[PDB]
Amino acid sequence: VNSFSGYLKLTDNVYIKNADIVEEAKKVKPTVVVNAANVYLKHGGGVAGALNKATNNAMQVESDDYIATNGPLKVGGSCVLSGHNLAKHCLHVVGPNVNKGEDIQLLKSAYENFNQHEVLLAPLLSAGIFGADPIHSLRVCVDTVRTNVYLAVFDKNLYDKLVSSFL
């Protein structure tokens, strides 16, 4: 048993809810929250800008030190950093950004990072401002992640369409 509440069960291991991931993280304090990161860990908008704002910019300060030491992530890659006031850990995962021309086949590689963690609170990778088909992102999630994932869909109209189209 875990602390996640009000989720619709899609599969053995994937759950979904219409929720603000920031507000969900603040309530649950999950072991792992996933950030929709870019390779530079520049947290400006969407999930990253919202998560970073909720940490009072401490996520960005920590991220800048990580990049200064290690250089940029790979598209499809990840790193584990602090969850600050939101979670124990933040798994920063880089899905491909369609609005930068990145290979959508890298979305499966991105979701494979989730398998290193038994339970996660996450957004749909590459959805919204990343320019990919969200319905596609949910299918790749279900067909790739084997650990227990609680998806927070921010946009209500996107949530209802994802549920009503789910195979």
Interface residues with ligand OHP (CB under 6 A) are 46-47, 123-124, 127-129, 153-155, 158
Closest approach, Cβ 33 to ligand OHP, in A, equals 14
Smallest Cα–Cα separation from 36: which of 45, 28, 27? 45
Closer residue to ligand OHP (CB): 46 or 72 = 46
The answer to whether 43 and 63 have CB atoms below 8 angstroms apart is yes
- Three-state secondary-structure class, residue 108: helix
Question: What DSSP string describes 50-64?
Answer: HHHHHTTTHHHHHHH
Closer residue to ligand OHP (CB): 1 or 25 = 25
Closest approach, Cβ 47 to ligand OHP, in A, equals 6
Position with the least CB separation from ligand OHP: 128
Closest approach, Cβ 95 to ligand OHP, in A, equals 10
Closer residue to ligand OHP (CB): 36 or 39 = 36
Closest approach, Cβ 71 to ligand OHP, in A, equals 26
∠ at Cα 96 (115, 113), nearest 5°? 10
Give Cβ neighbours of residue 48 (< 8 Å, ≥ 6 apart).
Answer: 35, 36, 37, 38, 42
